[PDB]
Design a protein around this ligand. Sequence first.
Ligand SMILES: *[C@@H]1O[C@H](CO[C@@H]2O[C@@H](C)[C@@H](O)[C@@H](O)[C@@H]2O)[C@@H](O[C@@H]2O[C@H](CO)[C@@H](O)[C@H](O)[C@H]2NC(C)=O)[C@H](O)[C@H]1NC(C)=O
Length: 531
Amino acid sequence: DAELLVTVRGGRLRGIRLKTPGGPVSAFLGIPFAEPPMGPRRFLPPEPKQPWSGVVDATTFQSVCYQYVDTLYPGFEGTEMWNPNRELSEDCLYLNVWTPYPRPTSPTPVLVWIYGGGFYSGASSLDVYDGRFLVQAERTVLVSMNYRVGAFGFLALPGSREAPGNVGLLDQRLALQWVQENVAAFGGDPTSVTLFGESAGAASVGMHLLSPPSRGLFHRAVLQSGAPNGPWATVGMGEARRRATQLAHLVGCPNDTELVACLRTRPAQVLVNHEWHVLPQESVFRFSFVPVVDGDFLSDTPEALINAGDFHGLQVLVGVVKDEGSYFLVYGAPGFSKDNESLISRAEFLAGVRVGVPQVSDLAAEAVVRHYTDWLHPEDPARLREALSDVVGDHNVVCPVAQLAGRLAAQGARVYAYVFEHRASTLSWPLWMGVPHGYEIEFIFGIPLDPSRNYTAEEKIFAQRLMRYWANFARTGDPNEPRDPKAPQWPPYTAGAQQYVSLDLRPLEVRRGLRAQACAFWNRKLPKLLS
Ligand SMILES: *[C@@H]1O[C@H](CO[C@@H]2O[C@@H](C)[C@@H](O)[C@@H](O)[C@@H]2O)[C@@H](O[C@@H]2O[C@H](CO)[C@@H](O)[C@H](O)[C@H]2NC(C)=O)[C@H](O)[C@H]1NC(C)=O
């Protein structure tokens, strides 16, 4: 097949035809975009891939970046669906391109996916990120890349040349430069690039928005369930140095240069084994090696750059799932488990707040408890279970997203906002978790269209609607149908009105205020109290 041969700047590629019920797609999987960041290049910014002779076979997903493997529930679908599904390697900087068949004769908009996983995990090869249904349905081009995670991507000894930090974000930036240089060979339009990502992938999209060298590489952004101003998404230089130094001592090391030089001698898995030990306190939704406010990739804190930024000419689509917190509770909140109803005592709730809002004063913890307590039913196990879910979801995702969305809309950007409220019929997590973090992704990617799976007919329709919204936004910056001269069915989000839509089997509903009461607490009152 002629459409499976493509020449990019580094040389020739051979892709693979992929099937869907609607029609075939052409896929180029495992394209090397950087030199393998191994041995002496561990912890260093990525270097462009050198050209090659002959043909790179591009028919298989390439290795996953070295990372921790979850073993909370071995074999359970709800956790395994996020675990590596290829071998781990430091040789992992590869990207993937899905393009319509036949290849577009006029350049089509490009969606660039950045996976999440708390900056410690993730892979572009997970089945739930299968680009074929999106591309077939709406005939955009889809790119996804691997980027280094954990210590390999974000260990930072700030101010040093040997571990400057943020190199996982530089991996993403290099892949975006690769798209600028090469996506036209696949029929993509390098002048119409929309970044989209979930969780740490959303936070990453946010950091490119705020970093001038990345900002020229794309035109629009989708932030699903994450934000660069989240309390987990960045660390200070002092804390970053403290975690890297503690990691070095836990592996036996041993002067910045000598420290990193010793870290480079240890096998990858040895670093991974100690990754969690460097967190200071017991927590959920906290990760050891994350982007560092270095004065380089980020000139200032994400909060400062958001408040100071001019965002005219930008369109942004942002959103959250209905139960952002629940997934994280089984990772350390006492009384919680996927295997029962997790109907917790008030004692367990008070202990859960300390894990759910780690390293905060007794004074702040009291305010949190009071805000989230119904003092007429302070002991009700169901209310307490939901309240702790809200504590974790609001503090880590929803209020950081609401804050960013308001500042963007107020400062020039056009913003659309959603809450995803449909619980998949195939969802393996228990019913008390609701619509948890990560479980809109399979609908955005049209996974219900896969005949090998068991979704309902209405869920297949819902997936097609969502692919249409996302592709409308990629094409025009506007999820509404372009031919519509009526007032928008999905209205912009504004700092004052705060309109957003519910995404469910039902038609769109406009609502206002993304949990405005909770986010007044986290973004205004709680800061003022501790001030
Ligand atoms: C719900 O389960 C938690 C966790 O227990 C685990 O999951 C169960 C379904 C079962 O498989 C247990 O064998 C597991 O250990 C319960 O919280 C635990 O309670 C025990 C006392 O029974 C205590 O010793 C543990 O420290 C608790 N663990 C945590 C993480 O808090 C909880 O009581 C269960 N709720 C029920 C049954 O209503």
